[PDB]
Amino acid sequence: EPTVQCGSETGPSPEWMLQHDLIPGDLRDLRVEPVTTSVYSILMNVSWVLRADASIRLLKATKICVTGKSNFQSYSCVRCNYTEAFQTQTRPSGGKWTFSYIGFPVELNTVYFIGAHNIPNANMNEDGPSMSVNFTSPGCLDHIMKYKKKCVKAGSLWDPNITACKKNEETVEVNFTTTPLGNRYMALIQHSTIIGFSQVFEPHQKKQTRASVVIPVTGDSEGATVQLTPYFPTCGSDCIRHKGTVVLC
Amino acid sequence: EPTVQCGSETGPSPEWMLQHDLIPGDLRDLRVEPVTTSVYSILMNVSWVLRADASIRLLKATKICVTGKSNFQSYSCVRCNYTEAFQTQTRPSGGKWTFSYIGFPVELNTVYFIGAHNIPNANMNEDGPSMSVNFTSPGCLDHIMKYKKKCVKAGSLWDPNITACKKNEETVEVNFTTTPLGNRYMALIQHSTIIGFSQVFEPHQKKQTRASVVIPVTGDSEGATVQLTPYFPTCGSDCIRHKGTVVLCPQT
Amino acid sequence: EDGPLNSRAISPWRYELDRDLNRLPQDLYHARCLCPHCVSLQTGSHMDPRGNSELLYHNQTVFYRRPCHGEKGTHKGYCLERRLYRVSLACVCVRPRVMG
Amino acid sequence: LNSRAISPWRYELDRDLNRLPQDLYHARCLCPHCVSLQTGSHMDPRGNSELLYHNQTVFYRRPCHGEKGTHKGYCLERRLYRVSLACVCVRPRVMG
Amino acid sequence: EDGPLNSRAISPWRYELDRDLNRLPQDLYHARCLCPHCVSLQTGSHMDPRGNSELLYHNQTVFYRRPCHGEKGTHKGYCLERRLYRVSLACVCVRPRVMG
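^ inputs. structure came back:
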């Protein structure tokens, strides 16, 4: 009953220094599943189907690895052997052989390109063994996952409580509770173009009451859209935003 | 240098009566090409790409089959053995192994299919090793096959010499040349709807000149197309039809 | 149009594959025609709804093998099992039915 | 990222048997003009997209030039390569 | 606005110097864009607040100095310390992430 034990190994493979007379087969299949760990990080399992058509007579290692491509550029590889020498073209119990693995860290809006091939590979000038699977990871717009501290610092759970109302044909009033996580608030009112703008500076307050800002507007502002952009020292320019409403008082 | 030698054999494979511990691998790719023989027949050269991934250590036959679904439906396919055993992945010259075979009969208006698998075959409860290559052969509307005898009896190369013109508003005159190869003919004209119909009853004539047909019409016949079909006892209802074009005969 | 009769049929029918590891022939190219209504004969592409299309069938002697019934123990074996297999052949479109 | 840029780009497979890593990607943004910020689907032609590149490290192996005869051998030869990173919105170059 | 796109992008971006006695190259520049949002397209001077600018990094190998760890005593010595450096290349106009 063979098993697979793996450790991280990235770099040149010592197998490339020797040209092997006989080479193994390809891989039938490959699929990767996302899981959530208990608390609260995310790790990844990999699944593939080793060849059934007798391609097995010789094989030792199958290294599976990925380049992580976000704003940051990341790449690492995992090399490991199969601990027992195969003799059957399926499980003696039945079905094509299967194995899996865990341990790949996962980040925010990071797309991973995971590809596999058997070890050793072919010499120069033969057919390519390429087999890889593309993937999609979610961001911080999912209702499940507001609980990472990194996104919380972006005020993920913060409720601006924006209440925006029109005083007269030219002045609009907005009310909302302040926050100890930031100091500067701005306002965009968009119906078709920019109708009015203002900037607010306030360090903090212990009472934490609803604010009140006077913002001039041009033309008919009925049915416009209010949007708030909060500044935090951490998120900077990529700070998350929230809607706002327009009502008449 | 192992070579290929094929001998016709269809039926149950002896090797299918025994289960093998190890089975031979798949095939990379199968290509087949249509060729023409010297005289005047059409044949096919099949070609396949054999494995390099250690599957050459054991493989003895590579059964290749052809099926067609036309008026006929046929299944007779040849098993081919490999003369010599292999000890290496590629020739000392090098390159991917490619093999060929000629001799499968080919006919007209047919869609064929080609199978692929090797001998011995897989045991029970295993992966399907088959790959597909599809193909199609031409008929007798091309210049190169204008000399095919069967469709020659059908009138592959005949010249209709169709000339039809409007006699008047209620009659259209048609002129064309016949041949002893036909004895009964039909007659239709269609412009937007069926505007005229008839049949031609004339076995043959000795001196063999152009004909003349009187056909009534329902309304205007200008701009229509003339269509005539022979009734040949061999081609039956599968008989080719030649186009036509009507003109105006002026009273002057 | 010109072609092997499946490009000139009113209800053209394609030829799709099935696999078995213990059947002869390994493929039985069945017909599954999409055409639900007799196409117009002045076009070869137009959709004419005046007809209903249906399949035609026959039963073909085929070959199956399951392992030997007896526990001989010498080898797995097989049996020379003859049972008839259901196959569609060719499409025709037909006049529908009238109620009232 | 690439689902959010004003000139989005995708990544196309380019495999080799002699490049480390075995896979590299050259982005070609499909946009000949920068998209509109108000709709995200309407085509705004006032901009253009131009590829951004750098130069990166890759590795190759050649068989030994010296006729050793013991084996094919290997060498860690190092030349450079050109690969893109992204597309930028550019104000055109006009004359008149 | 004309130039090597460093003034022509909707997200203009200057340079800042980074000096060091033992980097090869001694010159690395960090992109430090200057706008809080993307510039306007129809005027070239007025300010368009719906966009954001973000850095895009990459890894380019450089060389550093430590003295020889072994106490040879011949001289202070030097070594080719080979690790990476993270720099910025271009600020880009991006559609932000908004919840609601």
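Residues 149-153 of chain B form the longest helix (5 residues). The CA atoms of residues 38 and 144 of chain B lie 12 Å apart.
thumbs up if we can close this ticket
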